[model samples]
Target: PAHGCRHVAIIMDGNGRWAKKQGKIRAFGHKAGAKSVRRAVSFAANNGIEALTLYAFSSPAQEVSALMELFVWALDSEVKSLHRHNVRLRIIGDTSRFNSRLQERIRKSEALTAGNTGLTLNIAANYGGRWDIVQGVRQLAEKVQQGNLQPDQIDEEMLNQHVCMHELAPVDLVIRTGGEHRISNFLLWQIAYAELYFTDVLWPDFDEQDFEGALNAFANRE
Candidate 1:
């Protein structure tokens, strides 16, 4: 409902390995990963798919210098390209925990493309499946605390309204590049019934052909 196929999520993995293969520092790989993000967003939009959610960064990113620098760069640089391509950017995470400057940049980035009509690209930064679930529960608790909601009133649909992607449709497909075969705590509730596609190809190395190959694999799934 948000776009064409409704919703889609992606785990952009293997940046460090992609950098290592080129004899570059992990930071370089993250920079390369940013390019891949740009490509993926554009590809999803051009393909008539809507609501592309990407695993942009996580809480672990703040502890790693390479990832930290990339996070800042991503927030600062993403708006221009996204706006140019008419893509809406949304950072789905507990961003208040980030540094003020980083938060401001993220706010600016989201605001820049808030009104776009193409692809609604949601970036999962400083996010995790557990955190999302806990926050959903917390929201319900707060409403009850204020006497605005009764305990019995809280249900799946109630919790769904409080989740990060509440307004958006559920994920229809998920693509994970890199050789890893784990969910890594991404969108637990959202991807409950979505098709999963994994590949040995690193994020930077993935291309149109690789994406089509994944789609073909999904088509053949039983």
Candidate 2:
């Protein structure tokens, strides 16, 4: 029903906005994300894709704590299935914000399927495009400051190597849910020439068909 895709980045928007519309509690919002993550993971893995990075994280400490809870829940709930699908689970971003127990789980979760030969599912938690660039540039700055390289030596391609998922193919398709048109601080540098697809469907309601809408549209891109 669709065509080829390698690197895919999704702005999983409206994790709970639609859930609240139904008058449900916020935790169910987290639950909704999990269901779609599960749904999309299966879809992406089965399709001819190499990597799919789903974005998440942020809010106050109270909400942030719950954020990790959802992270843990998804990790616990899906790692087995992901492994079965031969998908590697890699969480990229500010993981230092996590506790020892949760951090341990992350390491173990990734370790379990790091060697998997199928799709690599990247959870871009607590990650922003500016943050990613800043972190990467800081490394370059330090190297330049230490006289390891001149400022002129730093170029666009050099920075590309510094950002996350540098080894994966550049993101060809960026899908944003929740009817949003803004990039919302997603992979700004990497998406320099990516195909953008926006949908009114909430993240909770984003299903295989919705993904196919973008997937098929992408097939027409010359």
Candidate 3:
């Protein structure tokens, strides 16, 4: 993903901060975010992107349960579209802590598109970049303890091959929406040289205009 951006990691921020004057504050703008999710998916599918990563959140079951419901709604609503387009859906992150119903659905959704050789759509739920590194480190530590791997054998390439938290490609462009700017611990190690594209447009407000904004930013980086 050089100029055209093969791997794009978007923060998709501002669902909680959407303007409340024109609508219900309790809505949290997730419905709107879902709209952008669909739009972003379409963008990736059409643009020939290898992978597109998006972030989702979870909190109390009472509160986070709504978020979980939104995710299921998204999958049920768009899974077919994704499958139709030959895009694989991979829900990255440790999802065991989630409710069984949601977890099972997540698995089914992923399995449904496991064969898609097109764009790999990665959805990060309850995930942290640091958590990924820790898990990767734990794996190597165990290998060393069992004498399966020598201390000298441990290096960037080994970890690079091992710490595939998302098994994702190195991020080419990271877009943070909602006028905010930060990695937010989304994908720490993967974005080492990625171009940061920050925008004032909120997640729900994000559109082709914003996406292309980042696109041209990378395309014209010379």
Candidate 4:
């Protein structure tokens, strides 16, 4: 079995459902999910994984405020811990819509952990695969418009160079919890050949063993 699964992405789903099943509020579920995130980061760092991308927030206008609050909370509470473990924290997505305070915290958090040499943890908030591609294209379009690039000069490699996480290796495995079977618009360009793992465990219940199972499945894939 191959062992070099350097990058792993996860679609953390079913927080609300898990909360409901426990007769708790959605916010409670989200809080529980945060703990699971810590476990995941620790596992990845201890297991030699280089990068871990977590899909935490998506486009839902009604839930945006709450999600933002959760993101801020996670950043405030986890950044120091992550840094202590030598993990680099990065929040990817369109953050301009976030309030000024939240944006500032994110910038500060990233800067604080920029020199970490261990796991690179990416929290995808307000992120979408299409938006990622569009943003990358927008950069190239601006270059061409400014006469710095020609239309024919743009190719897949050129575009890839502009996409998000271009410095990291392509996603080696994608795990979608809560029994979901869709990518949900995550790292579309990067996960072209990733091994997909679907599990019924809710996000709040996901643990190190579950992650190991995914890794084992990925290793045995032909």
Best-fitting candidate, scored by lDDT: 4
Writing each residue's lDDT as its tens digit, candidate 4 over 9-121 gives 99998888889998999889988987898899999999999899999633248788777887787688888899999999998898878889889999999999999999999
lDDT of each: 0.79, 0.85, 0.79, 0.88
Candidate 4, superposed: residue stretches over 4 Å from native: 57-63
TM-score of the candidate numbered 4? 0.93
List candidate 2 segments past 4 Å from native.
57-59
Q: Which of the two, 1 or 4, has more TM-score?
A: 4
| Top-TM-score candidate index | 4
lDDT of 2 at 166: 90
Better of 1 and 3 by TM-score: 1
| Deviating ranges (above 4 Å) for candidate 1 | 1-4, 56-70, 219-222
What TM-scores do the predictions have? 0.88, 0.90, 0.87, 0.93
RMSD of 1: 2.9
lDDT of 4 at 105: 96
Clashes of each: 0, 0, 1, 0
Relative to the true structure, candidate 1 reaches a TM of: 0.88
lDDT of 2 by residue, 17-68 (tens): 8778989887888788778878998898888788999875222569877778
lDDT of 1 by residue, 166-217 (tens): 8887887888888888888888987878888888888988777776676666
TM-score-superior candidate, 2 or 4: 4
